[PDB]
Write a protein that binds this DNA or RNA. Structure first.
Ligand SMILES: Nc1ncnc2c1ncn2[C@H]1C[C@H](O)[C@@H](COP(=O)(O)NP(=O)(O)OP(=O)(O)O)O1
Ligand SMILES: [Mg+2]
Ligand SMILES: [Mg+2]
Length: 418
DNA sequence: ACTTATGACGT
DNA sequence: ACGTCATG
């Protein structure tokens, strides 16, 4: 019934903003965004504080536009090195967080600001230690129970406590429900440890799988955690849009909506697994049939380290690189940042990348990557990497350079122990 | 002219 | 191996 494991998803609240606000006290408790490349339209927003969201400011907005919605908006710029954005500060901030999470349980780095946790084992330990002890409300100061309260509240904290009381009073409530509660107690502790040790606040979702735990985390932001039990799923999914569920945000979800003629996740229950398979594939049908019943089996991978390391730049419109000299210069600029990142990787993580991937895009092409080619990554030399990368894409030139290049991408892959 | 990184799947 | 999809 997918009530076998306890899985959590922890996600930092407006991460890049918190990172800047910690370092610059002035930006704290104020409408705040983080931008990059100020020259064109004040730059592009990649992170918005909650105060700034009250005014309607969103990521992928122009800073000049954001200022129109929010006159008093404070802006922080991404560091620029070698003529491109540099995310080093946010990656180091990430490492602090990932390290604190590691002490509690085994984690899967899902993004720079979020990881999954498997609390299944930890829950078992706590119960033996905690055996015969009731769970106090004090143990869950920031926990929301989805679907509660019900029955017999005007303030949001009042609703939270009321729901928490009903759930705790029942714990009536099964063995898998008790495990989620202990799972959540542990998440309270882990979240408190993050803020105390780094100054960063965050939200969390606690459930039986990664899809639900991720959905749960969203429900109460920021600085709150949410438990989505097995029993809540039917009511929660019933009015829940398909696009909301992870991996249904793009084309597949659209085709499910278009083919099946439904709009909510719950509506999938009526169809047989075979029906779903025939429409959307064997792998997807099977996945859909279980997910709408709240059952998901993807494992929490024990991976704290990124599989791959890469850098890229985009040369939109006029700025597009139409000469051999420019292509050579930016590969070198990219290869140089890559070398710094790669060297650090070896010292911290005892591993080396064996392959190098070059991806490029050209004018008139929609696709993120027009093409990609690879070659051997034998040495961490920016000049060699840049020179080799030129060699594997040099043919690409139809011609000077034609067509001019929209983007350059260099990626390191295939790391091995050492 | 929403950029810059990531991971997984299909074939 | 190379393209594509999905996500942050
Ligand atoms: N499309 C994008 N392009 C570039 N950088 C991005 C990005 N999306 C996110 N980032 C960077 C900047 C972001 O701060 C960060 C975290 O990812 P989120 O969790 O998706 N968003 P946040 O933590 O800001 O807040 P909250 O979760 O509470 O809504 O990654
Ligand atoms: Mg976040
Ligand atoms: Mg996130």
């Amino acid at each position: 019934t997918g009530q076998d494991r306890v899985v959590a998803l922890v996600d930092m609240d407006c991460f890049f903003v918190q990172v800047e606000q910690r370092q610059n006290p002035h930006l704290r408790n104020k409408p705040c965004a983080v931008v990059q490349y100020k020259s064109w339209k004040g730059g592009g927003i990649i992170a918005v504080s909650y105060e700034a969201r009250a005014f309607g400011v969103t990521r992928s907005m122009w800073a000049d536009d954001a200022k129109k919605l929010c006159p008093d908006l404070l802006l922080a710029q991404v560091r620029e090195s070698r003529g491109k954005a540099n995310l080093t500060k946010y990656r180091e901030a990430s490492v602090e967080v990932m390290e604190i999470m590691s002490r509690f349980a085994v984690i899967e780095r899902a993004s720079i600001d979020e990881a999954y946790v498997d609390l299944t084992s930890a829950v078992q330990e706590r119960l033996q230690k905690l055996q015969g002890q009731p769970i106090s409300a004090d143990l869950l100061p920031s926990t929301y129970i989805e679907g509660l309260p019900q029955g017999p509240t005007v303030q949001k904290e009042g609703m939270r406590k009321q729901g928490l009381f009903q759930w705790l009073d029942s714990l009536n409530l099964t063995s898998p429900d008790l495990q989620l509660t202990v799972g959540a107690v542990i998440v309270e502790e882990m979240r408190a440890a993050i803020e105390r040790e780094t100054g960063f606040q965050c939200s969390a979702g606690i459930s039986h799988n990664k899809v639900l735990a991720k959905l749960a985390c969203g429900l109460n932001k920021p600085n709150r955690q949410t438990l989505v039990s097995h029993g809540s799923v039917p009511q929660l999914f019933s009015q829940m849009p398909i696009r909301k569920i992870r991996s249904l945000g793009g084309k597949l979800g659209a085709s499910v909506i278009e083919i099946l003629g439904i709009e909510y996740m719950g509506e999938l229950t009526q169809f047989t697994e075979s029906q779903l398979q025939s429409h959307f594939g064997e792998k997807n049908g099977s996945w859909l049939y279980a997910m709408c019943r709240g059952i998901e089996h993807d494992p929490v991978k024990p991976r704290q380290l990124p599989k791959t390391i890469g850098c890229s730049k985009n040369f939109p419109g006029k700025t597009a690189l139409a000469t051999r000299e420019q292509v050579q210069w930016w590969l070198l600029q990219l290869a140089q940042e890559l070398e710094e990142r790669l060297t650090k990787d070896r010292n911290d993580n005892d591993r080396v990348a064996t392959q190098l991937v070059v991806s490029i895009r050209v004018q008139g092409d929609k696709r993120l990557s027009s093409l990609r080619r690879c070659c051997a990554l034998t040495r961490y030399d920016a000049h060699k990497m840049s020179h080799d990368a030129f060699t594997v894409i040099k043919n690409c030139n139809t011609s000077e350079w034609s067509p001019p290049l929209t983007m350059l991408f260099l990626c390191a892959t295939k790391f091995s122990a050492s």
